[PDB]
Amino acid sequence: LKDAQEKLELAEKKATDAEADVASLNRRIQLVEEELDRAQERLATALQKLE
Amino acid sequence: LKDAQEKLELAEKKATDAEADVASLNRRIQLVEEELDRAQERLATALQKLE
Protein backbone atom coordinates (compact mmCIF):
# COMPACT_ATOMS: atom_id res chain seq x y z
CA LEU A 1 0.00 0.00 0.00
CA LYS A 2 2.85 2.45 0.60
CA ASP A 3 4.12 2.04 -2.96
CA ALA A 4 0.59 2.11 -4.38
CA GLN A 5 -0.27 5.36 -2.58
CA GLU A 6 3.05 6.96 -3.57
CA LYS A 7 2.31 6.09 -7.20
CA LEU A 8 -1.19 7.52 -6.78
CA GLU A 9 0.24 10.76 -5.38
CA LEU A 10 2.80 11.19 -8.16
CA ALA A 11 0.27 10.37 -10.89
CA GLU A 12 -2.31 12.80 -9.46
CA LYS A 13 0.26 15.59 -9.12
CA LYS A 14 1.43 15.00 -12.70
CA ALA A 15 -2.14 15.01 -14.04
CA THR A 16 -3.00 18.22 -12.17
CA ASP A 17 0.13 19.98 -13.42
CA ALA A 18 -0.65 18.79 -16.95
CA GLU A 19 -4.19 20.19 -16.69
CA ALA A 20 -2.82 23.54 -15.53
CA ASP A 21 -0.39 23.52 -18.45
CA VAL A 22 -3.25 22.74 -20.85
CA ALA A 23 -5.30 25.67 -19.56
CA SER A 24 -2.31 28.02 -19.80
CA LEU A 25 -1.55 26.88 -23.35
CA ASN A 26 -5.18 27.28 -24.44
CA ARG A 27 -5.39 30.83 -23.10
CA ARG A 28 -2.05 31.51 -24.79
CA ILE A 29 -3.56 30.21 -28.04
CA GLN A 30 -6.54 32.56 -27.84
CA LEU A 31 -4.31 35.52 -26.92
CA VAL A 32 -1.93 34.91 -29.82
CA GLU A 33 -4.85 34.39 -32.22
CA GLU A 34 -6.28 37.76 -31.19
CA GLU A 35 -2.88 39.39 -31.75
CA LEU A 36 -2.64 37.67 -35.15
CA ASP A 37 -6.06 38.99 -36.17
CA ARG A 38 -5.10 42.52 -35.17
CA ALA A 39 -1.84 42.23 -37.12
CA GLN A 40 -3.69 41.02 -40.23
CA GLU A 41 -6.12 43.94 -40.00
CA ARG A 42 -3.21 46.38 -39.70
CA LEU A 43 -1.58 44.75 -42.73
CA ALA A 44 -4.72 45.16 -44.84
CA THR A 45 -5.16 48.82 -43.91
CA ALA A 46 -1.49 49.56 -44.57
CA LEU A 47 -1.61 47.88 -47.98
CA GLN A 48 -4.66 49.93 -48.99
CA LYS A 49 -3.01 53.18 -47.91
CA LEU A 50 0.15 52.13 -49.77
CA GLU A 51 -1.74 51.61 -53.03
CA LEU B 1 -3.87 -1.47 -3.00
CA LYS B 2 -6.61 -2.39 -5.51
CA ASP B 3 -8.30 1.02 -5.26
CA ALA B 4 -4.89 2.70 -5.32
CA GLN B 5 -3.97 0.85 -8.53
CA GLU B 6 -7.29 1.72 -10.17
CA LYS B 7 -6.80 5.38 -9.28
CA LEU B 8 -3.23 5.12 -10.61
CA GLU B 9 -4.56 3.87 -13.94
CA LEU B 10 -7.15 6.64 -14.11
CA ALA B 11 -4.61 9.32 -13.16
CA GLU B 12 -2.01 8.12 -15.67
CA LYS B 13 -4.61 8.00 -18.46
CA LYS B 14 -5.77 11.53 -17.64
CA ALA B 15 -2.18 12.79 -17.42
CA THR B 16 -1.32 11.24 -20.80
CA ASP B 17 -4.42 12.85 -22.31
CA ALA B 18 -3.42 16.24 -20.90
CA GLU B 19 0.15 15.76 -22.16
CA ALA B 20 -1.21 15.13 -25.66
CA ASP B 21 -3.30 18.28 -25.22
CA VAL B 22 -0.10 20.11 -24.24
CA ALA B 23 1.66 18.87 -27.37
CA SER B 24 -1.23 19.90 -29.64
CA LEU B 25 -1.67 23.30 -27.99
CA ASN B 26 2.07 24.06 -28.12
CA ARG B 27 2.10 23.13 -31.81
CA ARG B 28 -0.79 25.54 -32.36
CA ILE B 29 1.05 28.17 -30.31
CA GLN B 30 4.18 27.92 -32.44
CA LEU B 31 2.28 27.93 -35.74
CA VAL B 32 0.20 30.99 -34.82
CA GLU B 33 3.39 32.63 -33.54
CA GLU B 34 5.04 32.10 -36.93
CA GLU B 35 1.99 33.51 -38.71
CA LEU B 36 2.07 36.57 -36.42
CA ASP B 37 5.79 36.98 -37.16
CA ARG B 38 5.07 36.97 -40.90
CA ALA B 39 2.25 39.48 -40.36
CA GLN B 40 4.48 41.86 -38.40
CA GLU B 41 7.23 41.56 -41.02
CA ARG B 42 4.65 42.53 -43.64
CA LEU B 43 3.61 45.44 -41.41
CA ALA B 44 7.21 46.68 -41.17
CA THR B 45 7.58 46.47 -44.94
CA ALA B 46 4.32 48.40 -45.32
CA LEU B 47 5.54 51.17 -43.02
CA GLN B 48 8.76 51.36 -45.03
CA LYS B 49 6.71 51.73 -48.21
CA LEU B 50 4.68 54.46 -46.48
CA GLU B 51 7.91 56.34 -45.77
The residue in chain B having the minimum alpha-carbon distance to the alpha carbon of residue A49 is B50
Method: cryo-EM
What's the resolution in A?
A: 5.0
Give which of B17, B26, B42 to mutate to test A binding, by max A Cβ within 10 Å: B42
Hey, what long-range contacts does A7-14 have (CB within 8 A, 24 or more apart)?
A: A7/B4, A7/B8, A8/B4, A8/B7, A8/B8, A8/B11, A11/B7, A11/B8, A11/B11, A11/B12, A11/B15, A12/B7, A12/B11, A14/B11, A14/B15
* Mutation site for B-interface testing, chosen from A13, A24, A40, A48 by largest number of B Cβ within 10 Å: A40
